[PDB]
Write a protein that binds this ligand. Structure first.
Ligand SMILES: C=C(C)[C@@H]1CC[N@H+]2CCC[C@@H](C)[C@]2(C)C1
Ligand SMILES: C=C(C)[C@@H]1CC[N@H+]2CCC[C@@H](C)[C@]2(C)C1
Ligand SMILES: [Mg+2]
Ligand SMILES: [Mg+2]
Ligand SMILES: [Mg+2]
Ligand SMILES: [Mg+2]
Ligand SMILES: [Mg+2]
Ligand SMILES: [Mg+2]
Lengths: 304, 304
């Protein structure tokens, strides 16, 4: 799959080697892997590497928190595939009071204490900004087991749902926390079109690269948890083409979203509405889009 | 607007100039044009030229019937844009018994006697093949004023509907008539999938090139008759991008349908199922697709 031309230059956090070793090492000590094959596949995914490509301008003392959070969410994302919608919802819901710090974890259950200790450590570092990531994470968790996944969706409907299932808002709040980038309610409200556009590009670039993995999962994992819900399948069905053809067409649409990001950014600035915080923010989203694509193209999670 | 590469090479009927003069001449004689500007615009469109690009292997003594049929359907297609759905339906329904020859025309009304005399002349030339074009024409006519046009559609539902509104079946029956190409019911059943794929290409290439004309009509003509119903707007709305962006993506999808055509024809031949008639037929479909594109990208109908 030859990607169409992009003007976006991906950037990777400078501490990726040291932080990846630290965070992978942490999960290798604490998380319950089924076998050595799984431990190896985990390290091969490079979950801290993707986090560093998402947030290349994170503060040096904050990037590890983001890596830990996205890593545990990737691990859970995979566990949910073997669960019903009801079981997966129960699993996620138990973690929500624990994430808030309202309920102590069972220390015999790694996901519980990993989640508790992580969020405790984020609030210890920056309470106000850590708290702002909680509701975005919960909205994402609740979308993951939403019954609407078992109903036919068109492309527009899917993209609207997928903004939650892809964790767009949690990634935004996490980016801001990791950069120490504070924005006012007025500033946040101003960039909602840019956010929605960026969400489509993240979602579809992921759908493109993750399709083979997800198709296999739909044939082998749980009938609800493993259900094939992706733009690749939707466009293939609507246009009556193969999945490979649908990827090529969707990648061209991703580049139209890149152009639209640039146009909206130029418009924010030409309307006199671009603040220094917002300029940092929308450039940050550009790194999410290009970082996600670069990792998705290289990671063994999708190629194997 | 840069077309992506295509391996389909268009062909034009050898007698295109003389038949164009004969057929344009007949309509300039009989049809109720409102003024000289409209007569000029009519010749400028090149309706016999597109018919000769659609059916470049038509028999020399049948190509004119096809030019006359498509010419009158183009003229009616434009009249409907100034009508409500109800008025358009009443207008088309009047012509259906006349087309069958069951009801005599009012000779003071050009569309009625043009339609009556044309179908009488085609039945005199080849009764059985001319009869096979009637119901596909009527299916197309009914789609043109269907209320479904004014209700939300996704890309898949649009293409399903637009196979009727674009006249895919009448064009296939007309192609067979013009070539004297007789296929059995079992032969036609073998290429159903190839026909469905070819309809999407014809529809979307037309949509891409005729969008500016249709956008203008939508703002100036009847709010129902001239309603903007096209893949360019559907995709733009589903993906939240501009019409120009949608056209670029759709054009890539058209090349996927060309690859699919080639794959399906290859399989038909590989399974020992491509008869000489079917080989002529599928090659005929390819000329429709490339001919449509060449005319759409050059006709003054779409550029002015
Ligand atoms: C498409 C993306 C930006 C990521 C794809 C993988 N998932 C897995 C679970 C956590 C999500 C925020 C995300 C990293 C989003
Ligand atoms: C896309 C096509 C094959 C043709 C485009 C133009 N319209 C005009 C009105 C009558 C239609 C059958 C058609 C010739 C279809
Ligand atoms: Mg998921
Ligand atoms: Mg997943
Ligand atoms: Mg995926
Ligand atoms: Mg029409
Ligand atoms: Mg029209
Ligand atoms: Mg059109």
């Amino acid at each position: 799959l030859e990607p169409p031309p992009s003007t976006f230059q991906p950037l990777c956090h400078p501490l990726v080697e040291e932080v990846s070793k630290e965070v992978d090492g942490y999960f290798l000590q604490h998380w319950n892997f089924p076998n050595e094959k799984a431990r190896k596949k985990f390290v091969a995914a490079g979950f801290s590497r993707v986090t560093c490509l998402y947030f290349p301008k994170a503060l040096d003392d904050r990037i590890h928190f983001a890596c830990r959070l996205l890593t545990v969410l990737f691990l859970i994302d995979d566990l949910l595939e073997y669960m019903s919608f009801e079981e997966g919802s129960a699993y996620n819901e138990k973690l929500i009071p624990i994430s808030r710090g309202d309920v102590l974890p069972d220390r015999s259950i790694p996901v519980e204490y990993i989640i508790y200790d992580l969020w405790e450590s984020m609030r210890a570092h920056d309470r106000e900004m850590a708290d702002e990531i909680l509701e975005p994470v919960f909205l994402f968790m609740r979308a993951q087991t939403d019954r609407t996944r078992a109903r036919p969706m068109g492309l527009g409907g899917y993209l609207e749902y997928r903004e939650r299932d892809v964790g767009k808002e949690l990634l935004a709040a996490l980016m801001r926390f990791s950069m120490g980038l504070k924005l006012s309610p007025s500033e946040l409200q101003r960039v909602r079109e840019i956010d929605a556009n960026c969400s489509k590009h993240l979602s579809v670039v992921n759908d493109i690269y993750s399709y083979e993995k997800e198709l296999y999962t739909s044939k082998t994992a749980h009938s609800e948890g493993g259900i094939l819900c992706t733009s690749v399948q939707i466009l293939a069905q609507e246009a009556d083409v193969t999945a490979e053809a649908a990827k090529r067409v969707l990648f061209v649409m991703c580049r139209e979203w890149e152009l639209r990001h640039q146009l909206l950014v130029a418009r924010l600035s030409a309307e006199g509405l671009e603040t220094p915080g917002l300029a940092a923010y929308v450039e940050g989203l550009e790194y999410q889009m290009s970082g996600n694509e670069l990792w998705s193209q290289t990671t063994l999670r999708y190629s194997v």
